[PDB]
Amino acid sequence: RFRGEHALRRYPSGEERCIACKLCEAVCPAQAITIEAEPRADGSRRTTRYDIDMTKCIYCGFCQEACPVDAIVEGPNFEFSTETHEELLYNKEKLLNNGDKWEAEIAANIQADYLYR
Amino acid sequence: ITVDEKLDITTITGVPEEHIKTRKARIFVPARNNMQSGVNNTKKWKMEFDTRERWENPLMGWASTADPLSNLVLTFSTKEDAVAFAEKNGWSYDVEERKVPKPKSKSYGANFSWNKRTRVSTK
Amino acid sequence: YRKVRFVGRQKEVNENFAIDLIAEQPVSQVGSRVISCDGGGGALGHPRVYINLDKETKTGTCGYCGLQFRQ
Amino acid sequence: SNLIEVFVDGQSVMVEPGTTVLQACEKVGMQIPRFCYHERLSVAGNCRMCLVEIEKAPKVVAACAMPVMKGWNILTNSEKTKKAREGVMEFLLANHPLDCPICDQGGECDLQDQSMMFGSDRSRFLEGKRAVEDKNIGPLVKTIMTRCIQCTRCIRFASEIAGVDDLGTTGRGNDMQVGTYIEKMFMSELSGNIIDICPVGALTSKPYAFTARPWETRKTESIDVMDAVGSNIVVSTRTGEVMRILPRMHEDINEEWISDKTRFAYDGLKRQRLTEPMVRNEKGLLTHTTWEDALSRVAGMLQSFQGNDVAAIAGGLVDAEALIALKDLLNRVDSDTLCTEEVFPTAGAGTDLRSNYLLNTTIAGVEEADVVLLVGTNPRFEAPLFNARIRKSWLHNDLKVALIGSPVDLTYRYDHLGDSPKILQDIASGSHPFSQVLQEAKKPMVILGSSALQRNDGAAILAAVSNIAQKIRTSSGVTGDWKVMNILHRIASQVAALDLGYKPGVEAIQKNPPKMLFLLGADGGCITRQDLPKDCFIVYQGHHGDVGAPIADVILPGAAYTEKSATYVNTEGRAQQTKVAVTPPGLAREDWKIIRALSEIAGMTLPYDTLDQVRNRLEEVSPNLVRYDDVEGANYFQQASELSKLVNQQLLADPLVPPQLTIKDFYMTDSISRASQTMAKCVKAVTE
Amino acid sequence: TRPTVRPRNDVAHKQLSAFGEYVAEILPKYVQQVQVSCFNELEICIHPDGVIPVLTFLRDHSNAQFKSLADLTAVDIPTRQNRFEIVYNLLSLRFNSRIRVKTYTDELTPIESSVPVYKAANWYEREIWDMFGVFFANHPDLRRILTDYGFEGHPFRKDFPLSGYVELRYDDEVKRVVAEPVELAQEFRKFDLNSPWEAFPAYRQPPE
Amino acid sequence: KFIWTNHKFNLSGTPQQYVPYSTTRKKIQEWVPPSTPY
Amino acid sequence: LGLREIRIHLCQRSPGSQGVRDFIEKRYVELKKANPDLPILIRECSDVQPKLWARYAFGQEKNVSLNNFSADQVTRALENVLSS
Amino acid sequence: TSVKPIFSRDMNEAKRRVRELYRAWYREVPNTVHLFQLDISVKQGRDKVREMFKKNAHITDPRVVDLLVIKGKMELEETIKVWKQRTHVMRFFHETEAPRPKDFLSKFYVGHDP
Ligand code: SF4
Ligand code: SF4
Ligand code: SF4
Ligand code: SF4
Ligand code: FES
Ligand SMILES: [Zn+2]
């Protein structure tokens, strides 16, 4: 149940599991998340911009548990230590890359631990 | 004792910097976000300040700003103690009014007539 | 004007897109009236919603599910 | 006298013999949970969600629709009420989809702001949930009728005020839907106003649809200017951008309703916009410039010209504060020759005390009238909320309405009396029936519209109807005073402009050829360069670039209507100050402060700098521009009506035709209508 | 009512009712309202002239010792016609009981300080001066605690907006560490969470 | 599927350091003047 | 020029202004029968000191303050400016 | 006005109290100019003090003047001793901050109505 780097999962064959329902941004205590949706052309709604500061992130676990569609997950890798403040601001298309560098790591964790919560 | 009665208008200064004469406050009654129908949002006179520029922070798009007041709502109980706070700190203002609706005359059973015009269908 | 921040930084961007990766799904058929999709397996994925599949020309991917669903 | 002393919760209160339990319990400050009951509609009993346990009784009644007899004990909080509200509102939350991630009323919906406060705690169904299918109505209203608590509130709207009887109740039992059985589109004015009425997330907005949840917006009240009566809105900014706007429920105008054009036209604010000052370049070229080039450029020509060779026109949507800095700059140089875009004929009066130029019966007096006659106008597509007030006052008591000219579609049973200007001349005498019902009227009302008065025979029809307004008032007249003759408009900033002391109608510039003009009119093409003399310059000052900004010498930017604290005046002389929402983008500026920096770089420097000093300059000229929202009693036009008999112009031979189409003229009119592409996307769906 | 609902007792609800009955009976010069809290606590409203004596009555006695000052605090309240609210709190170590002393005040009207009665309220009174501006009279050492040397706002009151005016930075223009006007890189979004329908019927205000 | 090849790294300037940017359309879309002919 | 126009202010009540309320009855239709060039303005409510503005000579103000005249003093105090 | 004062009574003990502490600050300008090792001219430090006391002369009331005394009385603790490390004193002299226009036409080029 460890807390660490962020991620955005996606379904079997890809759908970008997020649906921009605006809850992971309303219970960040530190107001890190910054979502701006738009009706995407197919008709299903998605994000356009998604921004998580890694400095205002106080590492609750309040994004991890507010999500209905089970997308944004505090992933279990403390690998960090970049050299510029211009870098630790995350976009959308970092998190997916950072969330598809592993899902064999994350989906082994959540299947063990969803039975309690 | 030494109660030293007199009368002089209480005006305070020194605590803010220059925003005394630049900003006119605004006292209003909030009125019912109309997508719903609950009326607890009324019943408190508030005040709120002016809005100024919001540019773009040219690295992301965060609507960064100066104008350090920008987020202040106070909740006053009445008009009589509304204006009694804009003077004691000493800035200008402008006062709205409370609006309460028509009383009014509605009566189910008047929807069925013999010669009148109010007669509804499709129900 | 803006493009100078990635001079010699390789501009790391996404490679696969799910803007339209819906369409490679063999859109499911049932021959019924209303179907459940708690898609992605039980106790995970989006909550269960019942879609009407009677018209032109598909359910509508549940609003959540994304995957093209039909009869 | 005439009340019943009724005890709510063991506490006395005095109500009229014939109110409801709902209103009486709303007098001592309690809200029973409401679904099937809105104030401005009729009353039905088809959800059963107000259940008061009346004391000393076995049964439980609905507080929506029943009278209040001799003094009951209305016992709200008991142990039988709270077993009913909790039991009714487990029923409807069963057959219902599991949204609120994606349904767009996720902030306000009343299956959600009841069901924490009142109502149950958990669910027992545990499988089922029937699922009907959606359809389309128009490109305004996204319609998901899965959600549908079936409260029959949208259906009683259509049979009421917006008199298109189009929706219905189709089915029996659990199997029923709401929408239109055939595939007919439902579109009129006030058509998008149902998406406030709909108490759950079935009817929701199409252009706004998926942008932002409503706990983040910053509500700042404001007034909308696209129309005669003005409005009462509240804008909703997210990050410095307008997202959507609402009504604000002023009790005399916009009772709770807003116009459809005024709701879906915020897109024209931010699509096709000019941001910077631009230099001449000598060809058909026109290129941008830094702010300190084009200031003394035009201010050089002010010191050269003098007398009536410079003028200005202004007739659009600019306020009554950037129309003082124009008047004190062109008349300290003593060259007035300036008029509005709108044509209004003056015969004996018109700038002085105006005598009928404001709507003398207010909107709150419309519900008191008995015989309304109106001529020369199509009131449906100009000031629609005034039309809806007729629609209400035609119902709920008796009313008799006749119209002259051009058989059009009004939703209530009028009668087309005649179609010529000569009907006016004969009705000054006694003929062509109704003929004396105006004489037999107790509270008359004779409206001239501003569609017919723009014509070439305007000085005749002004004096003709004022004669029959004199004819009625000199008989008795009403009881009583009851001011009779009145007028409406279709341009917002005209009564604000004209009662500063301008002239009406572009005639003074239409005779002579002055050299330089300033255009704040402007997009209506009542002056082109062809009607002007040769390529001597005109300097343009606005915010949109539709027609007139390509044909210009130097253009200057301005802030539109959501960017500046302003003043506007509807058709009763109210004064409704709009407020700041967004600061204007780029190098655009406020309108009246570019005039002082035009003045101060030139010779004359005006004796006012801040906005409070501007409004004292207003209070000098007109003292009723700081008396906000008050209608004073001042008619003074018995002198004016005889003095307006001075001009003896006769009628013409043409039917009094309005410009408006079936609908299609309603959408694309002013300036913000034109650039807004949702008006461009809902106009081709009409024609097909 | 059920499980997961707090069980009350009528023992302490009767004793703390009966005890502080005669704290208004034997000093009716100062005490002007006493009310019993539903969770077995006592509040006692005291005119600000009785700041020292009703403490001094309590401070030593045979029937009410109250020898520990737990918490001195202060609340500001606009729309009261007298702004602030000074709230004392004490502890009967012999008796295991609590009582709170709620004395209203204003800005310019001083309060006689409780330095000589309790020496615990030396630091609890230099602090409140910094955070609101209440001038406690004849204080033996009044100074500047918990704030910087440049604040002039008394920031815990409702007129000081959340971020300050004096956002700080460094420059090499000489060597110094210098102030600036405040300059945020994000708006600090203000959400709206106050939902209608008046869910609490017991605490309901009078209708008017 | 949608898994990477072998691994990656968090390299401070490799020269690649990801240098974050904005991901929106521009907002107001200012109007352009008419053409060089009159 | 001079001149251009004038501005008759009044109040609806507080009856010290009652000279103009007879002046409109006596000399407006007789007044404005003469001078069919000058657009003299009438506005709403000063509520105290019912002044009378004049505006001419490159936009310069001349404000007499009739507080309470007769109906005949207001008849003759207008041609102070109307002649000039 | 039923409220006891702080120190003064009415307009005379107050307006001799404010003249008292001015003689403290006039004496304790040329001490801090070497006690902190700050290199300016000594007449700058005296100009700021005679600037500062004329700012508040619009008062028509006692115990408001007495409130400003307490702030003015307090600063001589920190300033006459060494509690401000060279930086809290130099904030009165806005050396870094750019000049404001304060005239109408220069505001109009830069800034949306400050
Ligand atoms: S993860 Fe959940 S809360 Fe976050 S944006 Fe997606 S749907 Fe909304
Ligand atoms: S860990 Fe907590 S603070 Fe950080 S982004 Fe998630 S919810 Fe926000
Ligand atoms: S649209 Fe839905 S919520 Fe509105 S009245 Fe019809 S069924 Fe009821
Ligand atoms: S309409 Fe009601 S039930 Fe449906 S999603 Fe919205 S709040 Fe939930
Ligand atoms: S609750 Fe609406 S019908 Fe009685
Ligand atoms: Zn699904």
Short mmCIF file of C-alpha atoms in Angstrom, two decimals, chain D residues 291-292 584 588-589 593-594 609, chain H residues 104-105 108-113:
data_model
loop_
_atom_site.label_atom_id
_atom_site.label_comp_id
_atom_site.label_asym_id
_atom_site.label_seq_id
_atom_site.Cartn_x
_atom_site.Cartn_y
_atom_site.Cartn_z
CA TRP D 291 0.31 52.27 -28.70
CA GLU D 292 2.27 55.54 -28.93
CA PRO D 584 -10.05 42.90 -21.67
CA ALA D 588 -7.53 46.59 -25.65
CA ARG D 589 -8.72 49.22 -23.20
CA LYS D 593 -10.40 56.34 -20.96
CA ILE D 594 -9.04 56.31 -24.50
CA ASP D 609 -10.24 61.43 -14.37
CA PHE H 104 -2.47 59.69 -15.78
CA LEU H 105 -0.94 59.26 -19.22
CA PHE H 108 -2.55 54.35 -19.72
CA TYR H 109 0.31 52.77 -21.66
CA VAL H 110 1.08 50.09 -19.06
CA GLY H 111 -1.52 48.51 -16.78
CA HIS H 112 -5.29 47.96 -16.78
CA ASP H 113 -6.41 50.66 -14.31
#
